[PDB]
Amino acid sequence: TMQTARKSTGGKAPHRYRPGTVALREIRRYQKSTELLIRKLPFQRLVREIAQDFKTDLRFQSSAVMALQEASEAYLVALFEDTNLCAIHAKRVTIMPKDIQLARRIRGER
Amino acid sequence: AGNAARDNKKTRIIPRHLQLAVRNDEELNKLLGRVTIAQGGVLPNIQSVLLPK
């Protein structure tokens, strides 16, 4: 303190996950299970509508509807697999109607 | 199928085990390539580009 000439300089010191996380975790959740994804009653009414345009006054066995749902969902899951491959091939991540149309074009479904 | 049952730690074979068994084999998949197994599902598969950083 008595330093008057050249003093001593020293001696002084809600949560929201990012987009894509829940989606991937949901993908893992549905790839592990095999339960049907489309609900049974709206699907059964839709098929009844389609059949009325083919032949009138028709009855369906419950097993017939379940078999229709099994083949339909398997076809759609496989189609989205091909659809996702097309979208990734176009340097994209998002599926678009052009991807499904391209997939069905390669399959020969016209 | 019995091997897949041991892996899933279940005594009785369910259609999931048949699906896993047929599709993991390279030749059984080609034989049943145009066949869908009821209550079978799909194999867990996520593309590389789709994985996070």
UniProtKB/TrEMBL annotation, chain A:
Q: Tell me yes or no: is Nucleotidyltransferase among this UniProt entry's keywords.
A: no
Q: Which InterPro entries match?
A: H2A/H2B/H3, Histone-fold, Histone_H3/CENP-A
Using the record's annotation, list all stretches that form the Core Histone H2A/H2B/H3 domain: 19-106
Keyword DNA-binding, does the record have it?
yes
- Top-level taxonomic group: Eukaryota
Keywords noted in UniProt = Acetylation, ADP-ribosylation, Chromosome, DNA-binding, Hydroxylation, Methylation, Nucleosome core, Nucleus, Ubl conjugation
Q: Name one GO molecular function term.
A: DNA binding
Modified sites of kind Phosphothreonine: 1
> Which family does this protein fall into?
Belongs to the histone H3 family.
Q: What is this protein called?
A: Histone H3
Native source organism of the sequence: Xenopus laevis (African clawed frog)
